[PDB]
Structure formats: structure tokens, C-alpha cells
């Protein structure tokens, strides 16, 4: 027995999904501190005391603090706190920052090299050490303090008994000889809880629920975890706590006054429909979840209207399955084209949600209204990057011709084409995939610039241009129906029709407003103006 | 801090010039007693 | 643009007192 | 001794429904069985809103409602002092009796209600605002330390209030610190109706108002007015028909006979109405007498087929949802009347919101400027239930010269873009 205690379940404390973490820590530190000091000599060397835990917000970060604290057999930890340190009369700072480092020292000179690890614990370790030349009216506490630190952890005088962790959200306020090998070196970052640490995280928090028998048997763990996705553990408590709020809620009634149920909460059982409920218009995540891209972009389904609806589908999903599994070629590029108001920017979101990627996004020109180039050219790289960091991807470009600002006098438009020409021939680094769709209205301007010889292929998306088609979609929308239908197919037979599939859910909507008796006869003329010849 | 250390040097000042004439009182007196002792 | 200007703070040294007057008194009674 | 009359704030029963739920719902049980669950219960609101939608009375009336010692209160600002090692040492103040309290009893305590006004005064992002000092990158850390982190604390609940949501520091909203973020907004028709009640109860107890004077006309008349403009359009009617009595002459006098029949008027409310209270969101009926000079006149059936077209399309735009957004472009040569065509049509749709986006307001404008006017009076549009908006003069807004031509491709990108973007849903 020298450091580790007993008790190392690491799951009684109350840690989630951070295995591999604490494994690292022992595999880089406070590991020569539980071996043969003889063997230590012989390779001879001296151990390390610094650690700096860096994550995103409300990341478990604090709740380590507290547990290492409990896990080492020794005396204590202390935890001081960044904004405290400082008091008004001169002086006091220096002396206060002094303490810290002091039971170590005398026990390096009583017991030169013998007795135990010291642990100081710096919460909000960015509050004092910020910089020393970048302030300005503020007498110099902050500098000196800092160079107090720095000369004491590091300096002519020698110390081996001490470990100094410190914790920060933002890591980049904090001085640079600090993060400097020889004080706080060895890094961490605690990132995001995966799909496994998700369950475990809801089960952890859940015990004392189910222990009582408080927790209906429909609500089923598993589902919920695969649900919630980009969560921290912040917000699975808030999910727990918010679904017993509103069964907490669901009990409890009175406006005009506020009063129990006559304690008729015999067991308050929570169900998955406050779960739902609670996922639904309660909790948030902080990255972000593309659903109302998806639910935006694909506005009405999609009808079948014929066969040209069914083969660039098939197309799709023969190249992501190319993309899935080849080693020869690790991008591949395709560009859907077709005349305008045909359902391209509805045709390509459907194919991205067949494949079933972990990484999926879409770049659309409805974000950057208002932007000049450079920063276009900025958020466009910035997409890509991220999408460099996976196993698999896929991102969609829609509506070139808008990105490039392109208007047809003189003709004029933007380094945006130099940046999209580029950025879709690097490969990514070794052993990841990708794939890129492009959405686009006018194939002779793109074939001008020298764009078209760099996508891999082309896809045509026709519009309705045979009257069964078009009677066809009319049955499947289901607007005109009876003798109606009768007397337009008798109608539209001959002359053929050129009219798009967004163009037909305007037409019949200007055709519905007027009374029973002229809606054929008005939808008709409508059509046969503005229907247009190819 | 000006009030309180007006305060303070003001009772200062007359505390030790009130001890020190007395003193120098007592001083002159005990020789009187002394001489008429012998 | 050039014109950068600043707010400052201040700090004092504080001194010993409260009993002192106590022996000054004793004496003197 | 309660009740939800009592505190007199109307038009916001969700909200209060909401607040109620989700922040003191685990407070009401017998200790049994919340202590069974092992939760924690949630420690901090935060509210905003445009200027004049009630946020300070919710703060007030939730102090008031708690059977609880008084509330604290720091109003912005009040922490900041310069002695270094005093802002912190302040705001560290505020908590000590909860500490003890939970030291003394424990899991037993009395609420300690904590009210900040203008939370952005002092809590802002880390890194910027760094104009020298650096008391205001530390005393963010303080409170981000006490809220939570070292010891327990269960006995706080911080309140916070705010006209600009975008400037707070991140980590002081994640669930854990300041979890119910609520939203308070214009009030609708109803709420109107609400309001207009509530301020004129004590009135009607005492036969000092009228009967002539009908509320639901007040109600349907008022647009896009706030609690405040309502309450000063009260305020202002009171005045004027409180000021008859006095003589306004040398030696000021007053008539002590005739004020005994102190009585109110729907034309005071009228003359209040457009003399001395005016809203800002919506469009007063001063601008439409800017563009209809000289009225609608009849020259022949021409100008009786555009408006019924007109009247065609706003109904289809307010019964259909295949569509949620539709056009329309007026054209013909110039002088005919294309800006006095288009303002009756918008006029005569009864619609909550209507704007007009001219080309005269900007004169001399850059670019830049052109595109963040537009795209301010699209994102004013699209916080409504349904609305209209009127873009007249295009080939001016993107300056046209035959010679060249010449004109500016930034404001024509974005109206090429606005002209296809739908709005939030059902909206
Ligand atoms: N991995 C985890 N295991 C258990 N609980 C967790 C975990 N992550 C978060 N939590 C829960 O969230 C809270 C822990 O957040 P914590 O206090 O560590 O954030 P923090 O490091 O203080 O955040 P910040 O760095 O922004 O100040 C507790 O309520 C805890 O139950
Ligand atoms: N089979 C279908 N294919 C495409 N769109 C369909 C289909 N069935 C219904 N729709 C509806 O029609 C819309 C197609 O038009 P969309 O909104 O994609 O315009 P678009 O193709 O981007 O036009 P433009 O390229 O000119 O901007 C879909 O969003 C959906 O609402
Ligand atoms: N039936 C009518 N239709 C339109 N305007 C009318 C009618 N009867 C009278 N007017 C008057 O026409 C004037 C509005 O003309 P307006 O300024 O809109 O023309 P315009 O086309 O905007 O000119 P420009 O396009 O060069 O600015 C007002 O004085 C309005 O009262
Ligand atoms: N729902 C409401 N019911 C009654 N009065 C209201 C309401 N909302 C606002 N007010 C009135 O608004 C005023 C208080 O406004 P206040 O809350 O301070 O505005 P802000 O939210 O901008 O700080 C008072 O005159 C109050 O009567
Ligand atoms: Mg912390
Ligand atoms: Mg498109
Ligand atoms: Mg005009």
C-alpha cells in the first residue's frame, strides 16, 4: 500500500465513460511513484507534478477534483480557488500564494527524500495567470504573483513531494511558461461522452430511482441513449431531472392557490411520455442537431411521378455504396443538374439521409446573407475541417451558381471559385472517405470556368413532360378528383406539357381560391399560358 | 485613515508631554525629602 | 484611433492600534 | 394568503405556468418522497426580452408571492469598487447566510432569493471587453466558482433579467447554473384586453368612468402596444380629461364645485391616442398618409382588377399551408401610381404586422449599410404569426444607370436570396 486505495470500482464514485482517461493518467504519471525506487535510480530520473485538464463546459472536469481527492491514500487535497488569492493591503498576495508550497518543503528538508505526494488543486487556474505584459492601470499584483508561482514550482530551489493539477475551461488565457515542459506539462482533454458512456452516464444517475421502484417498466434505457446525441452529462441530468418535474407537475394542481393532490402520488410512476415530452421542448443540446435542415429541406415528401424518380435515387445509393467500400479511391464527387424548379434541393437531401453516415451537413447560401468573399471562403473551409475529423462523411453544396454571385452581364462575379476548385481534389488523410454532392441550374456556365472536368459524374433531373404524368400527379396529390379529372385528361391529351414539380404546387394552390364552378376552367388557362413550350 | 490618525497623534502628543512634566515634577521634588532626610 | 486611454486602482499599508491606548492610560493613572 | 388576481399581471399564463412547473414543483411534497429521488433541485431564470413586455413585475411579484425572508438586490452595476480585492470580496458577500444556514440546519433551510438586474452590466464574455484593469475577467470567475463547483449548496435561487441575450458568457447558462431560460414577448390581442382590465379596475369601482367608453374598441385599435404603452395611454387620457377643471391662468386657481362630476371620454382616449402615445413596432397610420396623398380615385376598371387581384392573394397567403410564402410584382411605366396601388392593398389586409422598406430613408449609404437594413426589417418580419412587406422602387434600391450599366451586385445576391427563404414554422 503507497498511494492506491482499496476501493477502485471508479464506478461506486460516480465517473461515467472516462475508462481509457484515468488509464493514460496511470500510464504517464503516478506510476514510477509504485515501483522499486532501486530500479528508479538505476535507470536514474525524477517523476512529474503538473497536470492540465482542459474540456468543454460542464464536462466532469470539477467532479475529478473531488474523487481523486477521496481515491489517494494520503493526507488531503486543497482546493483554492483562482479569485480568492488576492486581498487589498500591499503585500498579502505574495504571502498568501507562499502558503501553498510550504508543509512540502519542510517535509523535503525533515524528510529528504522520504514521506508522500503533495496534491494543491487550482480551480480556475486562468483567473490568476493570464499574462504578464498585457495588462495596463493595475498596479503589478498579477505579474508578480505569476512570477512567484513560476520561480517557486520551477526554480534553483528543489522540490519532488508536490503534484499541482489545475482546471480551466478556456485554455487559451493561460500564460505560456506555465504550458512550457516543466510545470504543468502532460496535457488532457475531456471530451464528449460516446454512445456507450451515454448509457452508462443515465444508469449512474438512475439507481436511486429504480432502488424504490419509482420508474416505469415501459421507459427503456437503450432507446434513449441512441436518441440523445451530442449531450453532455449536464444535460442527461437535465433530461432526468425535467422528466420528474413534469410528473412532479402532473401531480401537483391549483392555480388560484397551490396545493398536493391529497398525497394520491402513491407511486408517480414517470412514463416515456414525459421522457418524450421533456426531450422534446425542455432540454437542448449546445452543438446542435441538423433536424430542421432535414425537416426543412424536404417540405412535402416525395411523390412518385414516374420512373426518373426512382433511377437517380438508385444512382445515389450505388455511389455511396462505392464510397462505403473501395481503397483506390478514397473521395468521389457528383453534381445533379437540371432546369430550374425541378426538386434538385429535394433530390439531394433524401439521398444524404438514405446513407446513414455519422457526419452529414449542408452548406447553403441562406446562412451567409450579406457576406463578402473572404468570409464565405472562411465558413466554407471551416465545414470542410470539420468534416476531416471522422471515419466517413458526406457534405452537400446546393446551389453553386449563388455561391459564386454570378449574374449573367458582363458577366461578373468572385477567390470563391479558386477555393471550391481546390477544395474538391484534396484527398483526406489516410484511411478516412468522403463525398461531396453538388446542386446546380446552369451546366454552360459551369462547363465554362473549368468546373465540369473536375466533378466524377452527372445526373439529369427531368420535369414532367407527357400528360399521363402529369394526371398521375394530380391523382397522387389528390387535389381534382371525379368528372373534374375526367375533363382535364380529356383536356390536356396532345401538345405535351413542360411544366416543373414546383411549379405544379403553386398553379393548383391559385387555381383553389375561387368558387366550385370555375377552379377547372382557371387552372387551365393557367396552364396553357404560362405552360410554355420546351 | 486621516480622522483616525489625527485622532491618534493628537492624544499621542498630549499623553507623553502630560508624562513627561509630571515626571520631571517628581524628579524635582524627591531631592527636597532626600536633603532633609540627612 | 490612436487615442487609447485608461482606469487605474490603488492599494495602502494600514498600521497597528487599539490597545496602545490602554497602557498609555495605565501609565498616566 | 394568495392568490393569481391579486399580484395584477396579465397576458402571461403560460409563462407563469412554465416557471411554475419547472422551478418550484419539487418544493411542495412532503420531504418523503423528493428525498426518495436523489434530485437536485434547479438553482436559477433568466429573462429577456424587447424593452416594455414586464419583465421587472414577474421579478417583483415572484419576491412577493415567497413566504421567505426579503429578497436581496444589486441593481447592475452596484458591485464595482476600486480597492483591488473588493468587487470579489462583495460579491462573495451576498451568500454568507445561506452557507450558514445550510451549515446549521441542512436539507432544511428557507429560501435565499437573490434578484440581479441587468445581468449584462458586470457577467460578460471572457476575452473581450478588454479595454485595461481586469476586475471584470474576475469577478465572472468568482461567481462562476460559487454558483457551483466547491461545496454544496441547495437553498439559492438566482434571478436574472436582460435585453440582450447574445453577450452572456457561455458557461454561465449550461443546465446546472442558470437552467430555465423563458422568453417574454409582445402581447397578442388578448392580452391587450388583459392589460386594458387590469389598469382601469380601481376606476369603475367608484362611478369615475363613463359608460360611453367601449374597451374591446380600445383593444381592437391599439397595434404592436406594449404593458407600458398602454398603461402611459391611460395615464395620458386620465390628464386630459383631468385638466378641464383647472384654469390655466395668472395665480394658478382650481374649481372647487364643479369637480365633484370628474368623468372620462372615449374623445380623450381618441385625442391620447393620436396626439401623444406612439408605438414602435408596426407602422403608424402617419406613414400611410404619406403615400396616399390624394386618395383612390376612379378613372375606370383598370383600377378596380388590381385590387381585386390584390385581395385575392392575401387571402390565399393566410388559408394555405402547401405555401407558406408568396409574391407579386407591380409593373407598368412610370408615373401611373404604382406606390398609392400597393400601400391601399397592404392597408386594407387587417394583417398584424405591415412595414414599408423605401429608398428615401437611406440616402447615401454604403453597401454594407443598404444590406443591414434589409436584412433588420426581413428578421423583424419573421417574429410574428403573419405579415406583409413592401419593397417599392427596386431598380433604385440596387443603384441602375443605363450608361455602363452600372448597379451593385451585393444587394441584388441578397434579395435573390431573401426572396426564397421560408420562414420558422406555421409562420
Ligand atoms: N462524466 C460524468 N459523470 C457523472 N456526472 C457527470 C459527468 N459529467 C457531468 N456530470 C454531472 O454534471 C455535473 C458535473 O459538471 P462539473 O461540475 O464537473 O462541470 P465543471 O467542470 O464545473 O464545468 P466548468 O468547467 O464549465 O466550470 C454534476 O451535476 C454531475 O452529476
Ligand atoms: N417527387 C418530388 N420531387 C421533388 N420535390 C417534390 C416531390 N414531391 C413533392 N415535392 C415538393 O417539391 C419541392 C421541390 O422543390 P424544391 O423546394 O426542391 O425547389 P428547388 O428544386 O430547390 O428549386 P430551385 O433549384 O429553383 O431553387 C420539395 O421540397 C417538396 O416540397
Ligand atoms: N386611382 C389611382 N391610382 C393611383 N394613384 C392615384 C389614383 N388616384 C389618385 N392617385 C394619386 O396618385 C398619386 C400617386 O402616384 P405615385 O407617386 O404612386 O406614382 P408613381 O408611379 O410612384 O411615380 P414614380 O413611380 O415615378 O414614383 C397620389 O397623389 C395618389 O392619390
Ligand atoms: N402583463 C402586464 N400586466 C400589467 N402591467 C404590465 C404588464 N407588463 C407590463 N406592465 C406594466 O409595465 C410597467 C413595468 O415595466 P417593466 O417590467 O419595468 O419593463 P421592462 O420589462 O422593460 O423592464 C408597469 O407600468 C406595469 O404595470
Ligand atoms: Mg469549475
Ligand atoms: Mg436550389
Ligand atoms: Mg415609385
Given at each position: 500500500?503507497?498511494?492506491i486505495?482499496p476501493?477502485?470500482n471508479?464506478?461506486?464514485?460516480?465517473?461515467?465513460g472516462?475508462?481509457?482517461?484515468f488509464?493514460d493518467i496511470?500510464?504517464?504519471a503516478?506510476?514510477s511513484?509504485?515501483?522499486?525506487?532501486?530500479?528508479?535510480?538505476?535507470?536514474?530520473?525524477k517523476?512529474?507534478?503538473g497536470?492540465?485538464?482542459y474540456?468543454?463546459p460542464?464536462?466532469?472536469?470539477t467532479?475529478?477534483?473531488?474523487?481523486?481527492?477521496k481515491?489517494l491514500?494520503?493526507?488531503?487535497?486543497?482546493v483554492?480557488?483562482?479569485?480568492e488569492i488576492?486581498?487589498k493591503y500591499?503585500?498579502?498576495?505574495?504571502?498568501?500564494?507562499?502558503?501553498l508550497?510550504?508543509?512540502?518543503?519542510?517535509?523535503?528538508?525533515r524528510?529528504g527524500?522520504n514521506?508522500?505526494?503533495?496534491?494543491?488543486?487550482?480551480?480556475e487556474?486562468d483567473?490568476?495567470?493570464?499574462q504578464?505584459?498585457?495588462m495596463?492601470?493595475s498596479?503589478?499584483?498579477?505579474?508578480?504573483?505569476?512570477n512567484?508561482?513560476?520561480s517557486?514550482?520551477?526554480?534553483?530551489?528543489?522540490?519532488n513531494?508536490?503534484?499541482?493539477?489545475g482546471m480551466?475551461n478556456?485554455?487559451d488565457?493561460?500564460?505560456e511558461?506555465?504550458?512550457?515542459?516543466?510545470?504543468?506539462?502532460?496535457?488532457?482533454?475531456?471530451?464528449?461522452?460516446d454512445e456507450?458512456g451515454?448509457l452508462?452516464?443515465?444508469?449512474?444517475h438512475?439507481?436511486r430511482?429504480?432502488?424504490?421502484?419509482?420508474?416505469?417498466?415501459?421507459?427503456?434505457?437503450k432507446?434513449?441513449?441512441?436518441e440523445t446525441?451530442?449531450?453532455?452529462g449536464?444535460?442527461?441530468?437535465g433530461?432526468?431531472?425535467?422528466?420528474q418535474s413534469?410528473?412532479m407537475?402532473?401531480?401537483?394542481?391549483?392555480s388560484?392557490?397551490?396545493?398536493?393532490?391529497?398525497?394520491?402520488?402513491?407511486?408517480?410512476?414517470?412514463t416515456?411520455?414525459?421522457?418524450?415530452?421533456?426531450?422534446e421542448?425542455?432540454?437542448?443540446?449546445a452543438?446542435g442537431?441538423?433536424?430542421?435542415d432535414?425537416?426543412?429541406?424536404?417540405?412535402?415528401?416525395?411523390?412518385k411521378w414516374?420512373?426518373?424518380v426512382?433511377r437517380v435515387?438508385?444512382?445515389?445509393?450505388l455511389?455511396?455504396?462505392?464510397?462505403?467500400?473501395?481503397?483506390?479511391?478514397?473521395?468521389?464527387?457528383?453534381?445533379?443538374?437540371?432546369?430550374?424548379?425541378?426538386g434538385?434541393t429535394?433530390?439531394?437531401?433524401?439521398?444524404?439521409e438514405?446513407?446513414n453516415?455519422?457526419?452529414?451537413?449542408?452548406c447553403?447560401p441562406?446562412?451567409?446573407?450579406?457576406?463578402?468573399?473572404?468570409?464565405?471562403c472562411?465558413a466554407?473551409?471551416?465545414?470542410?475541417?470539420?468534416?476531416?475529423?471522422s471515419?466517413?462523411?458526406?457534405?452537400?453544396?446546393?446551389?453553386?451558381?449563388?455561391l459564386?454571385?454570378?449574374?449573367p452581364?458582363?458577366?461578373?462575379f468572385s477567390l470563391?471559385?479558386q477555393?471550391?476548385?481546390?477544395?474538391?481534389?484534396?484527398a483526406?488523410?489516410?484511411?478516412?472517405?468522403?463525398?461531396?454532392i453538388?446542386?446546380?441550374?446552369?451546366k454552360?456556365?459551369?462547363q465554362?470556368?473549368?468546373?465540369?472536368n473536375a466533378?466524377?459524374?452527372?445526373?439529369?433531373?427531368?420535369?414532367?413532360?407527357?400528360?399521363?404524368?402529369?394526371?398521375?400527379?394530380?391523382?397522387?396529390?389528390?387535389?381534382?378528383?371525379?368528372?373534374?379529372?375526367?375533363?382535364?385528361?380529356?383536356?390536356?391529351?396532345?401538345?405535351?406539357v413542360?411544366i416543373?414539380?414546383?411549379?405544379?404546387?403553386?398553379?393548383?394552390?391559385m387555381?383553389?381560391?375561387?368558387?366550385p364552378?370555375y377552379?377547372?376552367?382557371?387552372?387551365?388557362?393557367?396552364?396553357?399560358?404560362?405552360?410554355?413550350?420546351? | 485613515?486621516?480622522?483616525?490618525?489625527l485622532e491618534?497623534?493628537?492624544?499621542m502628543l498630549?499623553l507623553?508631554?502630560?508624562?513627561?512634566?509630571?515626571?520631571?515634577?517628581?524628579?524635582?521634588?524627591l531631592?527636597?525629602?532626600?536633603?532633609?532626610?540627612? | 484611433?490612436?487615442?487609447?486611454?485608461?482606469?487605474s486602482?490603488?492599494?495602502?499599508?494600514?498600521?497597528?492600534?487599539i490597545?496602545?491606548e490602554?497602557?498609555?492610560?495605565?501609565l498616566?493613572? | 394568503?394568495?392568490?393569481?388576481?391579486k399580484?395584477?399581471?396579465?397576458?402571461?399564463?403560460?409563462?407563469?405556468?412554465?416557471?411554475?412547473?419547472?422551478?418550484?414543483?419539487?418544493?411542495?411534497?412532503?420531504?418523503?418522497?423528493?428525498?426518495?429521488?436523489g434530485?437536485?433541485?434547479?438553482?436559477?431564470?433568466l429573462?429577456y426580452g424587447?424593452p416594455?413586455?414586464?419583465?421587472?413585475?414577474?421579478?417583483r411579484?415572484?419576491?412577493?408571492?415567497?413566504?421567505?425572508?426579503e429578497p436581496?438586490?444589486?441593481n447592475?452595476?452596484?458591485?464595482?469598487?476600486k480597492?483591488?480585492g473588493?468587487?470579489?470580496a462583495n460579491?462573495?458577500?451576498?451568500?454568507?447566510?445561506?452557507?450558514?444556514?445550510?451549515?446549521?440546519?441542512?436539507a432544511?433551510?428557507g429560501?435565499?432569493?437573490?434578484?440581479?438586474?441587468?445581468?449584462?452590466?458586470?457577467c460578460?464574455?471572457?476575452?473581450?471587453?478588454?479595454?485595461?484593469?481586469?476586475?471584470?475577467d474576475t469577478?465572472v470567475?468568482?461567481?462562476l466558482?460559487?454558483?457551483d463547483?466547491?461545496?454544496?449548496?441547495?437553498?439559492?435561487?438566482?434571478?436574472?433579467?436582460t435585453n440582450?441575450?447574445?453577450?452572456?458568457?457561455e458557461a454561465?447558462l449550461?443546465?446546472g447554473?442558470?437552467e430555465?431560460?423563458?422568453?417574454?414577448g409582445?402581447?397578442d390581442?388578448?392580452?391587450?384586453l388583459q392589460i386594458?382590465?387590469?389598469?382601469?379596475?380601481?376606476?369603475?369601482?367608484?362611478?369615475?368612468?363613463?359608460?360611453?367608453?367601449?374597451?374591446?374598441?380600445?383593444?381592437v385599435?391599439?397595434?404592436?402596444?406594449?404593458?407600458?404603452?398602454?398603461?402611459?395611454?391611460?395615464?395620458?387620457?386620465?390628464?386630459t380629461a383631468?385638466?378641464?377643471?383647472?384654469?390655466?391662468?395668472?395665480?394658478?386657481?382650481?374649481?372647487?364645485?364643479?369637480a365633484?362630476?370628474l368623468?372620462?371620454?372615449?374623445?380623450?382616449?381618441?385625442?391620447?391616442?393620436e396626439?401623444?402615445?406612439?408605438?414602435?413596432?408596426?407602422?403608424?397610420?402617419?406613414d400611410?398618409a404619406?403615400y396616399?396623398?390624394?386618395?383612390?380615385?376612379?378613372?375606370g376598371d383598370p383600377?378596380?382588377?388590381?385590387?381585386?387581384?390584390?385581395?385575392?392573394?392575401?387571402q390565399?397567403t393566410?388559408?394555405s399551408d402547401?405555401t407558406?410564402?408568396?409574391?407579386?410584382?407591380?409593373?407598368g411605366?412610370?408615373?401611373?401610381?404604382?406606390?398609392?396601388?400597393?400601400?391601399?392593398?397592404?392597408?386594407?389586409?387587417?394583417?398584424?404586422?405591415?412595414?414599408?422598406?423605401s429608398p428615401?430613408?437611406?440616402?447615401?449609404?454604403?453597401?454594407?449599410a443598404?444590406?443591414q437594413?434589409?436584412?433588420?426589417?426581413?428578421?423583424?418580419?419573421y417574429?410574428?404569426?403573419?405579415?406583409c412587406?413592401?419593397?417599392?422602387?427596386?431598380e433604385?434600391?440596387?443603384?441602375?444607370?443605363?450608361?455602363?450599366?452600372?448597379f451593385?451586385?451585393?444587394?441584388?445576391?441578397?434579395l435573390?436570396?431573401?426572396l426564397?427563404?421560408?420562414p420558422?414554422?406555421?409562420?
Open positions: 500500500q503507497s498511494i486505495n476501493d477502485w471508479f464506478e461506486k464514485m460516480g465517473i461515467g472516462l475508462d481509457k482517461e488509464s496511470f500510464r504517464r503516478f506510476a511513484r509504485v515501483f522499486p525506487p532501486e530500479i528508479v535510480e538505476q535507470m536514474g530520473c517523476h512529474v507534478k497536470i492540465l485538464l474540456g468543454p460542464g464536462c466532469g472536469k467532479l475529478l477534483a473531488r474523487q481523486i481527492g481515491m491514500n494520503a493526507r488531503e487535497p486543497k483554492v480557488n483562482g479569485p488576492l486581498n500591499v503585500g498579502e498576495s505574495e504571502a498568501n500564494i507562499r502558503k508550497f510550504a508543509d512540502a518543503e519542510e517535509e523535503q528538508r524528510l527524500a514521506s508522500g505526494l503533495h496534491i494543491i488543486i487550482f480551480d487556474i483567473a490568476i495567470c493570464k504578464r505584459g498585457s495596463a492601470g498596479t503589478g499584483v498579477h505579474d508578480t504573483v505569476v512567484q508561482l513560476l517557486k514550482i520551477d526554480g534553483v530551489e528543489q522540490l513531494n508536490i503534484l499541482v493539477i480551466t478556456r485554455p488565457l493561460i500564460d511558461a506555465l504550458l512550457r515542459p516543466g510545470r504543468l506539462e502532460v496535457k488532457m482533454e475531456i471530451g464528449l461522452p456507450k451515454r452508462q452516464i443515465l444508469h449512474i438512475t439507481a430511482m429504480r432502488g424504490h421502484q419509482l420508474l416505469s417498466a415501459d421507459v427503456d434505457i432507446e434513449l441513449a441512441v446525441k451530442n449531450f453532455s449536464a444535460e442527461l441530468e433530461l432526468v431531472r425535467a422528466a413534469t410528473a407537475n402532473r401531480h401537483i394542481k391549483a388560484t392557490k397551490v396545493e398536493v393532490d391529497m398525497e394520491k402520488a402513491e407511486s408517480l410512476q414517470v416515456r411520455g414525459d421522457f418524450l415530452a421533456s426531450l421542448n425542455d432540454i437542448k443540446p452543438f442537431t441538423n433536424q430542421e432535414y425537416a426543412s429541406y424536404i417540405m412535402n415528401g416525395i411523390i414516374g420512373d426518373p426512382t435515387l438508385d444512382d445515389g445509393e455511389l455511396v455504396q462505392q464510397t462505403k467500400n473501395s481503397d483506390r479511391t478514397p473521395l468521389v464527387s457528383v453534381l445533379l443538374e437540371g432546369p430550374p424548379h425541378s434538385k429535394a433530390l439531394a437531401a433524401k439521398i444524404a438514405e446513407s453516415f455519422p457526419f452529414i451537413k449542408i447553403s441562406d446562412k451567409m446573407i450579406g457576406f463578402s468573399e473572404t468570409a464565405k472562411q466554407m473551409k471551416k465545414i470542410f475541417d470539420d468534416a476531416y475529423k471515419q466517413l462523411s458526406c457534405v452537400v453544396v446546393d446551389d453553386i451558381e449563388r459564386l454571385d454570378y449574374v452581364i458582363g458577366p461578373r470563391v471559385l477555393a471550391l476548385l481546390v477544395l474538391l481534389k484534396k483526406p488523410p489516410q484511411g478516412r472517405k468522403l463525398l461531396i453538388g446542386t446546380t441550374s446552369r454552360d456556365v459551369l465554362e470556368m473549368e468546373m465540369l466533378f466524377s459524374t452527372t445526373i439529369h433531373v427531368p420535369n414532367i413532360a407527357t400528360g399521363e404524368q402529369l394526371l398521375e400527379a394530380l391523382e397522387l396529390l389528390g387535389n381534382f378528383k371525379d368528372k373534374e379529372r375526367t375533363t382535364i385528361a380529356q383536356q390536356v391529351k396532345g401538345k405535351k413542360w416543373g414539380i414546383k411549379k405544379l404546387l403553386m398553379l393548383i394552390e387555381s383553389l381560391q375561387m368558387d364552378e377552379r377547372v376552367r382557371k387552372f387551365l388557362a393557367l396552364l396553357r399560358e404560362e405552360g410554355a413550350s420546351p | 485613515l486621516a480622522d483616525e490618525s491618534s497623534t493628537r492624544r498630549q507623553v508631554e502630560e508624562s513627561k512634566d509630571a515626571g520631571i515634577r517628581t524628579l524635582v521634588m531631592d527636597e525629602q532626600g536633603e532633609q532626610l540627612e | 484611433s490612436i487615442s487609447k486611454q485608461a482606469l486602482e490603488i492599494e495602502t499599508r494600514h498600521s497597528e492600534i490597545k496602545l490602554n497602557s498609555i492610560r495605565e498616566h493613572d | 394568503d394568495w392568490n393569481f388576481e399580484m395584477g399581471i396579465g397576458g402571461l399564463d403560460k409563462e407563469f405556468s412554465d416557471i411554475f412547473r419547472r422551478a418550484f414543483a419539487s418544493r411542495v411534497f412532503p420531504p418523503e418522497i423528493v428525498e426518495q429521488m434530485c437536485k433541485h434547479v438553482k436559477g431564470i429573462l424587447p416594455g413586455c414586464g419583465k421587472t413585475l414577474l421579478a411579484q415572484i419576491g412577493k408571492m415567497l413566504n421567505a425572508r436581496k438586490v444589486v447592475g452595476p452596484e458591485i464595482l469598487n480597492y483591488v473588493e468587487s470579489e460579491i462573495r458577500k451576498l451568500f454568507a447566510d445561506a452557507e450558514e444556514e445550510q451549515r446549521r440546519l441542512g432544511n433551510s429560501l435565499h432569493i437573490i434578484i440581479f438586474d441587468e445581468i449584462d452590466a458586470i460578460k464574455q471572457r476575452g473581450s471587453m478588454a479595454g485595461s484593469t481586469g476586475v471584470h469577478v470567475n468568482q461567481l466558482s460559487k454558483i463547483g466547491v461545496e454544496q449548496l441547495n437553498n439559492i435561487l438566482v434571478i436574472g433579467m440582450r441575450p447574445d453577450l452572456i458568457d454561465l449550461r443546465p447554473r442558470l430555465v431560460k423563458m422568453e417574454i409582445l402581447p390581442e388578448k392580452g391587450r386594458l382590465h387590469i389598469h382601469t379596475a380601481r376606476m369603475r369601482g367608484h362611478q369615475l368612468l363613463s359608460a360611453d367608453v367601449d374597451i374591446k374598441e380600445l383593444a385599435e391599439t397595434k404592436n402596444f406594449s404593458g407600458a404603452e398602454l398603461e402611459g395611454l391611460v395615464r395620458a387620457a386620465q390628464s383631468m385638466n378641464r377643471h383647472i384654469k390655466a391662468s395668472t395665480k394658478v386657481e382650481v374649481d372647487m364645485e364643479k365633484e362630476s368623468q372620462v371620454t372615449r374623445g380623450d382616449f381618441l385625442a391620447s391616442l396626439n401623444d402615445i406612439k408605438p414602435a413596432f408596426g407602422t403608424n397610420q402617419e400611410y404619406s396616399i396623398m390624394n386618395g383612390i380615385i376612379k378613372w383600377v378596380t382588377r388590381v385590387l381585386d387581384d390584390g385581395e385575392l392573394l392575401v390565399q393566410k388559408n402547401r407558406p410564402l408568396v409574391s407579386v410584382l407591380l409593373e411605366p412610370p408615373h401611373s401610381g404604382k406606390t398609392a396601388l400597393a400601400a391601399k392593398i397592404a392597408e386594407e389586409s387587417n394583417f398584424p404586422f405591415i412595414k414599408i422598406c428615401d430613408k437611406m440616402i447615401g449609404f454604403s453597401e454594407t443598404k444590406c437594413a434589409m436584412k433588420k426589417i426581413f428578421d423583424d418580419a417574429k410574428s404569426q403573419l405579415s412587406v413592401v419593397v417599392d422602387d427596386i433604385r434600391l440596387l443603384d441602375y444607370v443605363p450608361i455602363g450599366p452600372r451593385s451586385n451585393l444587394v441584388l445576391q441578397a435573390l436570396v431573401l426564397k427563404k421560408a420558422p414554422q406555421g409562420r
